Design a binder for this molecule. Structure first.
Ligand SMILES: *[C@@H]1O[C@H](CO)[C@@H](O[C@@H]2O[C@H](CO)[C@@H](O)[C@H](O)[C@H]2NC(C)=O)[C@H](O)[C@H]1NC(C)=O
Ligand SMILES: CCCCC/C=C\C/C=C/CCCCCCCC(=O)O
Ligand SMILES: *[C@@H]1O[C@H](CO)[C@@H](O)[C@H](O)[C@H]1NC(C)=O
Lengths: 49, 49
């Protein structure tokens, strides 16, 4: 698996509604999914496999 | 009638297309949610969101 760094971003997932991607699993730990639009993060990493 | 990958969005404190723009539930929700597959009945009709 590989990892990526996320910096200098405006994280709005609503653009994903404009695409054609559907997620069968989406679960967050430590945060409610409804509080991701009014919150700011410090260091974001993304692992994919 | 929901897409099938959006059955998980019919729950309190959720996010997505359905939870934001189509059908919401309160955080303090009391009740039950029931779902089942109807591929043999609803696959030849028009449904929107
Ligand atoms: C949503 O996605 C569509 C394409 O699915 C985008 O529309 C394109 O926008 C670009 C940039 O302006 C144009 O050059 C294209 O002609 C548009 N159409 C297509 C079919 O590619 C659209 O900009 C996206 N964003 C929003 C907010 O609607
Ligand atoms: C590339 C990631 C950059 C950093 C993003 C970090 C936080 C902001 C929100 C993240 C949630 C991921 C998108 C969830 C979309 C749900 C769509 C659906 O339920 O169908
Ligand atoms: C990836 O981009 C291509 C080209 O615009 C598009 O046809 C395709 O649907 C996109 N894939 C996803 C999963 O959004």
């Amino acid at each position: 698996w590989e990892r990526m760094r996320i910096t200098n971003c405006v994280a709005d997932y609503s653009v994903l509604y404009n695409s054609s991607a559907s997620f069968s699993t989406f679960q967050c730990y430590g945060v409610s999914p409804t509080k991701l639009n009014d919150l700011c993060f410090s260091s974001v990493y993304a692992d994919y496999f | 009638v929901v897409k099938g990958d959006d059955v998980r969005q019919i729950a309190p404190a959720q996010t997505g297309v359905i939870a934001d723009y189509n059908y919401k539930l309160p955080d303090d929700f009391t009740g039950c949610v029931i779902a089942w597959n109807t591929n043999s009945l609803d696959s030849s009709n028009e449904f929107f969101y």
